[PDB]
Amino acid sequence: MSLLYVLLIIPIIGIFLISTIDSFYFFNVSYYKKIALITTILNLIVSLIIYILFDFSNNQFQFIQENLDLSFYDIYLGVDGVSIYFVLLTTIIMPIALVSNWNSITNNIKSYLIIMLLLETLLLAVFLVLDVLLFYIFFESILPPLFILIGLFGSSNKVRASFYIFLYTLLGSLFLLLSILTMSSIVGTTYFDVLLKSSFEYTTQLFLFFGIFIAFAVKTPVWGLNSWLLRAHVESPLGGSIVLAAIVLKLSLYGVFRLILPILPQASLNLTYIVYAIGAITVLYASFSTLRTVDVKELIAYSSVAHAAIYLMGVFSNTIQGLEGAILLGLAHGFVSSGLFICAGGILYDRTGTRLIYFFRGLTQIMPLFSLFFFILCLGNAGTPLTLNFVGEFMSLYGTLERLPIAGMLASTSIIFSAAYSIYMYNRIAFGGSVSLYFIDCFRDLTKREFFILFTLVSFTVILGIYPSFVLDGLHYNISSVVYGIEPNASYLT
Amino acid sequence: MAGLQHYKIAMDPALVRLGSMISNRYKYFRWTKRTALVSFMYVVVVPSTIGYLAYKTDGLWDLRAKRRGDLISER
Amino acid sequence: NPPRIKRQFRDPHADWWDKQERRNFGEPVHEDHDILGMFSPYEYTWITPGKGLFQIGLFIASFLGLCY
Amino acid sequence: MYLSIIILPLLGSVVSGFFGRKVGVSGAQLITCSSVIITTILSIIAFFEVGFNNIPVTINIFRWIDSEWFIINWGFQYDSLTVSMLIPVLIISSLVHIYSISYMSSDPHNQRFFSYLSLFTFMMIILVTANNYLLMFVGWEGVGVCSYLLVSFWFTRIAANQSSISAFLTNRVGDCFLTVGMFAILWSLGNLDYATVFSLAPYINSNVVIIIGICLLIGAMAKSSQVGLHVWLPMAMEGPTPVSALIHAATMVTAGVYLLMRSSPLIEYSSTVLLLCLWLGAITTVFSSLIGLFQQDIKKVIAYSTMSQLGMMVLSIGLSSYNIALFHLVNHAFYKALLFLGAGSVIHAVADNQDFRKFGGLISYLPLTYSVMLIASLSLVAFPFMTGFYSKDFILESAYGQFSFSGVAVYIIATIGAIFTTLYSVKVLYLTFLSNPNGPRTYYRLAIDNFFSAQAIKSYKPAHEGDFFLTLPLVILALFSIFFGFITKDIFIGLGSNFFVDNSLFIHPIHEIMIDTEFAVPVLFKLLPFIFTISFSVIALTLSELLSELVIYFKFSRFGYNIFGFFNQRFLIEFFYNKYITNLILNLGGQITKILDKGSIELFGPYGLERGLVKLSKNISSLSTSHVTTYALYILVGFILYLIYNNLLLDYSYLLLIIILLLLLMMIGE
Amino acid sequence: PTPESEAFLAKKPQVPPTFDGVDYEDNKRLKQAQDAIIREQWVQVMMGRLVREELSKCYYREGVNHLEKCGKLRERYLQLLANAKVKGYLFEQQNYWSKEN
Ligand SMILES: CCCCCCCCCCC(CCCCCCCCCC)(CO[C@H]1O[C@@H](CO)[C@H](O[C@@H]2O[C@@H](CO)[C@H](O)[C@@H](O)[C@@H]2O)[C@@H](O)[C@@H]1O)CO[C@H]1O[C@@H](CO)[C@H](O[C@@H]2O[C@@H](CO)[C@H](O)[C@@H](O)[C@@H]2O)[C@@H](O)[C@H]1O
Ligand SMILES: CCCCCCCCCCCCCCCCCC(=O)OC[C@H](COP(=O)(O)OCCN)OC(=O)CCCCCCCCCCCCCCCCC
């Protein structure tokens, strides 16, 4: 039983215990929440054990278990540098997501925990599978649990939201499936170790690129294909929102490393000016739009759109710096956007019952712990240094500028507007007068739970912001394998 | 109002009405001269302009280790 | 929609349910409420845009005349 | 010692801010002041250790960012320039911490205020001690965040909220240009560490240096309030007065000046950026000085006065002589920390009020407060044989020393700005101390004159001066504004001084103009600024309290009214900014949310499909009548269509068009 | 020369940095070839890191005289900056080239 298969098995045992413990003890709801939390903790503990044993400079997939009982659809698991940190981010985030809803579900708690635990197994399976069809099977398997999570525990407009996220993702994924099936037909197999060895013809690469890019653009999302995010990420329960923004957005980013950079390098090189136009447009249009967004979670949801454009531009830079920056920005956005949704969807929305920004003012006066963390998360969302958000933005933007300067400059302008919308929101909530006259009751400050799910998130971004080498050390050799090009005097040694 | 009891707010009817109008605004969009031009400016022209500049200047320069007597122009 | 005016043009000596933003509790609000209140870009009203550009040209011409 | 100068303000800021409950108000003041003073003393030693004996000290701790070619380390490097700028930074910070012991005595947030002041000092020290451009930019963003938190310190005030966003966003524009500039360094040189950029500077493409050089000048433009991005510094006067003195008048505004001075071994090889350095600095001198003459706020006049001194440094940078700019940056910092802190006494003296049109008397009520201004004022207007004389009255001479059209023209511009400099200098001095009492009688009511009968112990408020803590920095800064300029003029000017042979600053031999400055310049132009200074003072002093109505006659003409407002409205570079830049973006965001996101992209997307397909779905179902006779007809017609298509060898495109038509008609009701 | 450490024994490429003579069917040898491509590129680039490092110490040690004394160290970095860059194996794996063309 490989460590990687252990990762997928623990959350399934937790589901079993959650749904059977009543036959051994009316069981208290606190029991279910404790089973689910410990389950995610042991999954985090296993992912940390794997990371200690992980080797930073191996071109072999590590911790793979030999199957040799070949079938039509077999599940092979393996990990290298590009997948190791996405696996860690999934295992760190999900316990925080569980605590972020400890008190705010209050109904169908068994269903919420089983759905949350199942989502962990599926999302981890996405980052661990060593086959392109296996990748697709898990990328899509999460829609029905996502569809039912929003509908069971979402806000007032959760019906329109759940439909939007289901149908957008399916429609785009159906175009990715067509591209994937063409690959398996030509090659005979979708296993990574032998599909990357193959060489597709240019026009095949061109049509393979559109099919895959249409799906990755719905999931980034790119601007104009992002209606589903505006609805789903806001109407979802807080735990759903954290998982949706901090893990699910990353699948398309990790999928660019496994599905287009190795097999479609000519198409990627010849179409970067189209990816960059869409990437540049998304940086500006989203930034201007979130400046005028009045729902606090939708403002924070809309920020994810702007940052996802920056690491989408990085992965197509064909440079070592852009690709490392893209993973580091995708990781950084995972912590910071998780904290900002806890601040908005968890702290403000539980106190007031509303998310309109018009009703908030001067919260610093009564809530100095919320404002202290909120400001640090508003700095991190603005790409301020000593946050992992700056190291990722600077490396991602440097690659974008070097690959194509006109897009780099425009994507650079995000340094202004991210700051602009992040600080403007911060002032209309924490500063900007005395406590809002709409509040009749006074508000309490962060509970111990709220303090420690924020302190944990702001610790990860800051420590990684001062020493990003912890992550870059395990990306240097694997990131190198996805670069496409040669130097005049280093190529073809004899 | 929600599942978990919150504090008592002075829920202003005017602000509540404003936040509902925004959430429902998509149902009332119509194609007119104005709405067609704006939607054509943002979606087609400005993106196609950037795509033109990105396409035209892809590979035009390299800054790496450039010296005096050696240009930045690459094409 | 009410006529959209920056709330700074309200008077600060009126019976205001909220003095800081100079609004009664349930006043009808313009759909641009978010960018019409006190916390917002200040609307300077010393001169009108056409006349102001003329005055700047005088300084540039004077600056240009000094250089010549 | 070298690394203790780094962490000591940091530790002082962490304890005061995160444990203000534990140490209390006085505990915080004891730590921040002690940590800054101990740090300040060590810098004085470092000036001897590094500047005087010429030992640059390299300290590298651990790697920050390591990707292939980029190896950015948390490395610090002490040379002549960083210890030059560490002296005023630590000295005034020591004096501002001490000064704030009294100014904030009634503030209910003393621990937070002192925590911020020590964090800014830490961020300033990081900015100048770094040995690479990226780690420097951390302090660059660091002082910017500390500036934002100290402007918005009174966060319940809506107008100070707008100021901090102006401080944050205007500077962020500069950092975008600066970030792009480091990209161009990284792209061309592999890394952005100082010893690499300057080792390869004479050898890289001249066009590259222009691309490089322009970028950081725009970044330098934002953090030193140049005519383009200049609107944050006077708006940034909404914070407490020591913050205005420390961050917005003597230390951070000098970060843009520091960036060009450290980059001197690189920008020297680009006359295009250097020429842009000259005129840009020249422009902001008349721009700032003119506006300052027509400001009613004491702090707002001073803000315009800082912008002028920085503009002369930017001017001096264009003259290929960065040492004089370094000479003026240290010299300007002391006279300025003097002017503002003493000014803060004036606001503290009367009512927490700062409007000129209600100030008067106070010459005897605040004797010491008046005295420090006069020393500061003459140092600012470069009175002969004072601290500002050796710096301000050497930049102007250096400009004539370079015998060119650009050098002579900026002289005329700077002199006019220097002419208008003394007028607001006179306005500050006269309207607050040497004029008739324009404030209420409450300010001027001494117990010596019998006014009240019963409430004699109280209800006097005779505009008293400050305590020891308020006057000790005032006295100390006075000496620096008299003797420090003369004492150090040989280190920074000399004739062939070797204080920068460690290459910290770099001057190319072809760009040297200093020899002509001492000899070729004519005596008349050398003493010309003094002639205008000692003359135009008397007209300003005669235009008030002697004539006092020539100006109002000019004011109420139509020509004067338009000029007065234009200069009072700061050239209108904020009305077109607010309306044609800021609100343009706000309307662009409005259009995108309302027309596209909540608009066309929903209609030409999911919402349109939902509308149409429900319509299309309902019409097709209406053909399902359950009339068995009608169904038989449908089967026959489908039978006939299949026979036509296969028997007649129909083009497939005919079939698809027919289906599209059948959807079209079905899409139409009835 | 610096002795080869025990760590720099388990990761030495037993194969030359090339794809000529590699049977792409055989997985071990292709993977070794890709390993040799990347490691050579990284080895060549850390040369620039050490040269950059030395030039830094030279620059400070020489002060103003850096423009005249650190010349050899200047050029060596510039040559490395011109040539060394991790470009991956993927192009060379997929595209054969010959000098006798
Ligand atoms: C923030 C920057 C602040 C502003 C500073 C600008 C400072 C000046 C830089 C301008 C620059 C830097 C690239 C900028 C972006 C690169 C990275 C971006 C920033 C990285 C962070 C962009 O210059 C580009 O402009 C293009 C305009 O189309 C031209 O491309 C082409 O245009 C048409 C053919 O010329 C084609 O038909 C068209 O197909 C191409 O498109 C080219 O001129 C060039 O590629 C390079 O300018 C330099 O280019 C060279 C060749 O000209 C010039 O050398 C000259 O050549 C001989 C005949 O020329 C002269 O006899 C000789 O005397 C001299 O040797 C220079 O004199 C100078 O001009
Ligand atoms: C690695 C490959 C894995 C392949 C799949 C292996 C199995 C994965 C899980 C599939 C479904 C397992 C369901 C586990 C729960 C079953 C036990 C149970 O009865 O839970 C009941 C629970 C609460 O209901 P109850 O407590 O009885 O009522 C109380 C009312 N006060 O009620 C619930 O829990 C219902 C929870 C909501 C429904 C689940 C989430 C949506 C699932 C959509 C199903 C279709 C897609 C299946 C996808 C499988 C994973 C990809």
Residue D507, token pair as written in the block: 């001057």
Write out chain A in H/E/C secondary structure.
Answer: CCHHHHHHHHHHHHHHHHCCHHHCCCCCHHHHHHHHHHHHHHHHHHHHHHHHHCCCCCCCCECCCCCCCCCCCCCCECECHHHHHHHHHHHHHHHHHHHCCCCCCCCCHHHHHHHHHHHHHHHHHHHHECEHHHHHHHHHHCHHHHHHHHHHHCCCCHHHHHHHHHHHHHHHHHHHHHHHHHHHHHHCCCEHHHHCCCCCCHHHHHHHHHHHHHHHHHHCCCCCCCHHHHHHHHHCCHHHHHHHHHHHHHHHHHHHHHHCCCCCHHHHHHHHHHHHHHHHHHHHHHHHHHCCCCEHHHHHHHHHHHHHHHHHHHHCCCCHHHHHHHHHHHHHHHHHHHHHHHHHHHHHHHHHCCCEHHHCCCCCCCCHHHHHHHHHHHHHHCCCCCCHHHHHHHHHHHHHHHHCHHHHHHHHCHHHHHHHHHHHHHHHHHCCCCCCCCECCCCCCCCHHHHHHHHHHHHHHHHHHHCCHHHHCCCHHHHHHHCCCCCCCCCCCC
d(CA D336, CA A222): 51
Compute the residue count for chain D: 670
Contact D381, D388 (CB under 8 A): yes
Closest C-alpha residue for ligand 2 atom 4? A122
From ligand 2's centre to the CA of A47, what distance in Å? 25
Residue A162 near residue A191 (C-beta atoms within 8 A): no
The answer to whether the CB of A218 falls within 8 A of the CB of A171 is yes
Please answer yes or no on whether A272 and B12 come within 8 Å at the CB atom.
no
Q: Is the peptide bond before A221 cis (omega within 30 degrees of 0)?
A: yes
Per-residue CA distances from A118 to A37, A243, C22 (Å): 13, 12, 51
Q: Does D200 touch chain E (CB under 8 A)?
A: yes
Please name every residue paired with B61 in a beta bridge, in sequence order, or none if there are none.
B73
DSSP code of residue C18: B
Q: Which atom of ligand 2 is closest in space to residue A148's alpha carbon?
A: 41
This structure's resolution (Å) is 2.4
Distance A175 CA to ligand 2 centre (A): 28
Q: How far is the C-alpha of A133 from the C-alpha of A190, rounded, in Å?
A: 6
Closest CA to A313 of A223, A417, A183: A223
D193 forms bridges with which residues in the sheet?
D132
Matching residue, tokens 């004089």: D324
**Considering only alpha carbons, which residue of chain D is nearest residue C38?**
D158
> Any idea how long chain B is?
75
Size of interface A-C (CB pairs under 8 A): 17
Q: Please tell me which residue of chain D has the smallest CA distance to E66.
A: D199
The pair of three-digit structure tokens given for residue A388, joined into one six-digit string: 């992992």
Q: Residue D521 carries which DSSP code?
A: S
Query: Could you give phi then psi for residue A483, rounded to 5 degrees?
Result: -70, 140
Chains E and A touch each other (3 or more Cβ pairs < 8 A): yes
CB pair distance less than 8 Å for C41 and D582 = yes
How far apart are alpha carbons A390 and A381 in whole angstroms?
A: 9
- Å from CA of A115 to ligand 2 middle: 7
Phi, psi (rounded to 5 degrees) for D605: -170, -140
Q: Could you please report the per-residue DSSP string of D353-378?
A: --BGGG----TTTSHHHHHHHHHHHH
- Taking the centre of ligand 2 as the mean of its atom positions, its distance from the CA of residue A144, in whole angstroms, is 10
Structure solved via: cryo-EM
Distance CA D311, CA D410 (A): 11
Nearest residue (by CA) to ligand 1, atom 36, is: B75
Q: Look up residue D389 and give its amino acid.
A: F
Look at residue D212 and give its three-state secondary structure: helix
User: How many Å from the N-terminal Cα to the C-terminal Cα in chain B?
Assistant: 65
Q: Are strands D70-78 and D57-67 parallel, antiparallel or unpaired?
A: antiparallel
Q: Which helix (H) or strand (E) holds D469?
A: helix D468-479
Dihedral sign computed on CA atoms, order B49, B50, B51, B53: positive
Which single residue is written with the structure tokens 């149409």? D612
- Chain D within 8 Å of C44 (Cβ-Cβ)? yes
**Which of B7, B58, B61 comes nearest A441 by C-beta?**
B7
Q: How many CB pairs under 8 A join A and D?
A: 120
Amino acid at A420: A
Q: Give the number of the ligand closest to the Cα of residue A5.
A: 2
Rounded to an integer, what distance in angstroms lies between the CA atom of residue A359 and that of residue A432? 12
The answer to whether E50 faces chain B, any CB pair under 8 Å, is: no
Triad D356, D361, D363: Cα angle to 5°: 110
From residue A225, how far is each of D538, D589, E17, E66 by CA, in Å? Answer: 70, 17, 44, 56
Measure the CA–CA gap between A269 and A208, rounded to whole angstroms.
14
Contacts of A418 (CB under 8 A, 6+ apart): A287, A303, A306, A307, A381, A382, A383
CA distance D3 to D43: 11
B contacts of C17 (beta carbons < 8 Å): none
Q: What residue in E sits closest to A492 (Cα-Cα)? A: E18
Supply the DSSP symbol for C34: G
Flag if D65 and A386 touch (Cβ within 8 Å).
no
Assess whether chains D and C touch, using the rule of 3 or more C-beta pairs within 8 angstroms.
yes
For residue B15, the CA-to-ligand 1 centroid distance in Å is 54
D326: Cβ contacts below 8 Å, ≥ 6 apart: D81, D84, D85, D261, D492, D505
Is-contact D71 D64, C-beta < 8 A? no
Distance A111 CA to ligand 2 centre (A): 7
The two tokens of residue D275 are 């020429």
Angstrom distance (rounded) from CA A29 to CA A101: 13
- As a whole number of angstroms, the distance between CA A264 and CA A316 comes to 11
D61: enclosing H helix or E strand: strand D57-67
Inter-chain CB proximity D189 and E81 less than 8 Å:
yes
Which of E67, E68, E87 to mutate against chain D (most D CBs within 10 Å)?
A: E67
C-alpha to C-alpha distance for A397 and A408, rounded to whole angstroms: 6
Asked if the C-beta of A437 comes within 8 angstroms of chain B's C-beta atoms, the answer is: yes
Which residues neighbour D63 within 8 Å (Cβ) at sequence distance 6 or greater?
A469, D71, D72, D73, D74
CA D499 to CA D280: how far, in whole Å? 28
> How many angstroms away from the CA of C46 is the closest CA of chain A?
26
Which of A377, A473, A391, A385 is CA-nearest to residue A422?
A: A377
Q: Do D597 and A227 touch (CB under 8 A)?
A: yes
